[PDB]
Amino acid sequence: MISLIAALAVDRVIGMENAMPWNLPADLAWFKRNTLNKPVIMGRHTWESIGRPLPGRKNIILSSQPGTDDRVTWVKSVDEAIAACGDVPEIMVIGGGRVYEQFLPKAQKLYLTHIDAEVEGDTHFPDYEPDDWESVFSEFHDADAQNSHSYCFEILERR
Ligand SMILES: NC(=O)c1ccc[n+]([C@@H]2O[C@H](COP(=O)([O-])OP(=O)(O)OC[C@H]3O[C@@H](n4cnc5c(N)ncnc54)[C@H](OP(=O)(O)O)[C@@H]3O)[C@@H](O)[C@H]2O)c1
Ligand SMILES: Nc1nc(=O)c2nc(CNc3ccc(C(=O)N[C@@H](CCC(=O)O)C(=O)O)cc3)cnc2[nH]1
Ligand SMILES: [Mn+2]
């Protein structure tokens, strides 16, 4: 199955000028835990924003143009991306906006972090129909010395 993982600020903002303005170490730890030892699919802008391969994961980059780095796998279409993952139980789609839009109709599971922060951004998580999705896990955390905003981890399954 295909899963999406994302961190959303207020109004479903996920980025600004090809960056993520906030720093929430607990959420990056959640991201690592839920993606380690799985293939991750990302768009080219997100690859540039991360700036290096994610270790312990198969990194698959969507781009219409030839690959410029052989430490990761480059593919030209959604179907090629899925095929390059091979026969694994769970494929993790890690963004950005354009890629999330394309994979949402195929996805069975969403791993969402809702961050209580207002950010002026230029990229949004797709609008998803809430009737389609059941919450199966929810965990709220207040801000602390390490994480400057409160946040909620949620896992939704397609009904
Ligand atoms: N908060 C979060 O959870 C989160 C997660 C991920 C990313 N982000 C942020 O999202 C932003 C980037 O998002 P974005 O929407 O601008 O870009 P993106 O989805 O990361 O990348 C889009 C690019 O990927 C390629 N692509 C997408 N679909 C393709 C397809 N079917 N076939 C071939 N190539 C395809 C294209 O590259 P070519 O132009 O080379 O063809 C396209 O330009 C950044 O701000 C990032 O920090 C946030
Ligand atoms: N929940 C969630 N939060 C995010 O910040 C996030 N970011 C992306 C895209 N951007 C990034 C940017 C940096 C790293 C990163 O450095 N990850 C390290 C963190 C190690 C740690 O802090 O524990 C990694 O090994 O995963 C991952 C994804 C996709 N899905 C997300 N999903
Ligand atoms: Mn197969």
UniProtKB/Swiss-Prot annotation:
Listed GO biological process terms: 10-formyltetrahydrofolate biosynthetic process; dihydrofolate metabolic process; folic acid biosynthetic process; folic acid metabolic process; one-carbon metabolic process; response to antibiotic; response to methotrexate; response to xenobiotic stimulus
Effect of L28R: In strain: B[RT500] isozyme 2
Impact reported for M20 to I/V: Increases catalytic rate 2-fold
Listed pathway(s): Cofactor biosynthesis; tetrahydrofolate biosynthesis; 5,6,7,8-tetrahydrofolate from 7,8-dihydrofolate: step 1/1
Resulting phenotype, E154K: In strain: B[MB1428]
Outcome following mutation: C152S: Increases catalytic rate 1.5-fold. Increases catalytic rate about 7-fold
EC code(s) of this entry: 1.5.1.3
More details: The strain K12 sequence is shown.
InterPro entries: DHFR (IPR012259), DHFR-like_dom_sf (IPR024072), DHFR_CS (IPR017925), DHFR_dom (IPR001796)
A Gene Ontology term for the protein's cellular component: cytosol
Entry's Gene Ontology molecular function annotations: dihydrofolate reductase activity; dihydrofolic acid binding; folic acid binding; methotrexate binding; NADP binding; NADP+ binding; NADPH binding
UniProt family annotation: Belongs to the dihydrofolate reductase family.
Effect of M42Y: Increases catalytic rate almost 2-fold. Increases catalytic rate about 7-fold
Name assigned to this protein: Dihydrofolate reductase
Assigned keywords, A-Z: Antibiotic resistance, Methotrexate resistance, NADP, One-carbon metabolism, Oxidoreductase, Trimethoprim resistance
Amino acids binding NADP(+): 7, 13-19, 45-46, 63-64, 76, 95-102
PANTHER family the UniProt entry points to: DIHYDROFOLATE REDUCTASE
NADP listed as a keyword: yes
Reactions listed under catalytic activity: (6S)-5,6,7,8-tetrahydrofolate + NADP(+) = 7,8-dihydrofolate + NADPH + H(+)
